[PDB]
Amino acid sequence: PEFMALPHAILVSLSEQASSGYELARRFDRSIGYFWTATHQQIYRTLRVMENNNWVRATKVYAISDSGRAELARWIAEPLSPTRPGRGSALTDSSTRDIAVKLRGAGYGDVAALYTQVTALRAERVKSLDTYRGIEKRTFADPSALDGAALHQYLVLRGGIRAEESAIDWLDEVAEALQEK
C-alpha cells in the first residue's frame, strides 16, 4: 500500500476535498486523470484498503485521517525508488507521474524533499538521453541517407530523444519554480 502510488493520489484528492466513493472517482477523472489512467473499480478497491490502515475515515463521505495525512507527508519525502517499475526511460519510468502527484499535494510533505527528487530524476533522464545520444551517433551517423527500416528506426529513436529532453525541460521548470519558493 505504501509502495504503490494510487493510494497517495487519492490521499491528495482527499486532502484538498473530502468526497465520497463516486464523488472521488468523478473528481479524480478530471483533476489527476490527465496523468493517471485509473478506473472506478480501482479507486474503490484502494479506498477500501485505505480504511484498513485507518488512512481514511467514514465521515457516506470519506476523510483523510491523521495517519493518512502522515503517510502522504512520508511518501512525498520518500526518495526515488531503485525498485521502481520502468527505470531507464521517460516513456516507461513512472517517476514523472509520481512527481506530479507529490507536486500537487505538497502541502502534506515538504518541497525541499521533493526538490531533491526532481533533481535526482533529471540526472537519470540525462543518463537516458546520453545513452540515446550514443546510439544516434554510433548507429545513425549522417541522418540523411536513411531509407526505409533504417529511417523508421531513427525516427522512433527520435521520439525517445524528444521525450527525454521534454522530461528534463519540465524537471528544470519544476526545479526552478521550487527554488524561488
Q: Residue 143 phi/psi, 5° resolution?
A: -90, 30
42 forms part of the interface with a second copy (CB under 8 A): no
Number of chain residues interacting with a second copy (CB under 8 A): 41
Instruction: Determine, following the binding rule CB under 5 A, whether residue 95 of this chain makes contact with Cl ion.
Output: no
DSSP, collapsed to helix, strand or coil, labels residue 66 as helix
Instruction: Examine residue 65 and tell whether it contacts Cl ion (CB under 5 A).
Output: yes
Sole residue written with cell 528534463: 168
Half-sphere exposure of 31 (CA within 13 A, CB side): 16
- Residue 4 is a binding residue for a second copy (CB under 8 A): no
How near is the Cβ of 52 to a second copy at its closest, in Å?
28
Number of residues that bind Cl ion (CB under 5 A): 2
- Residue 169 interacting partner from a second copy, Cl ion, none (CB closer than 5 to 8 Å by kind): a second copy
Give, to the nearest 10 degrees, the angle between helix 95-104 and helix 149-177. 20
Scan residues 71-90 and list those touching a second copy (CB under 8 A).
85-86, 88-89
Sign of the C-alpha dihedral, residues 163, 90, 30, 115? negative
- Residues forming contacts to Cl ion in the complex (CB under 5 A) are 65-66
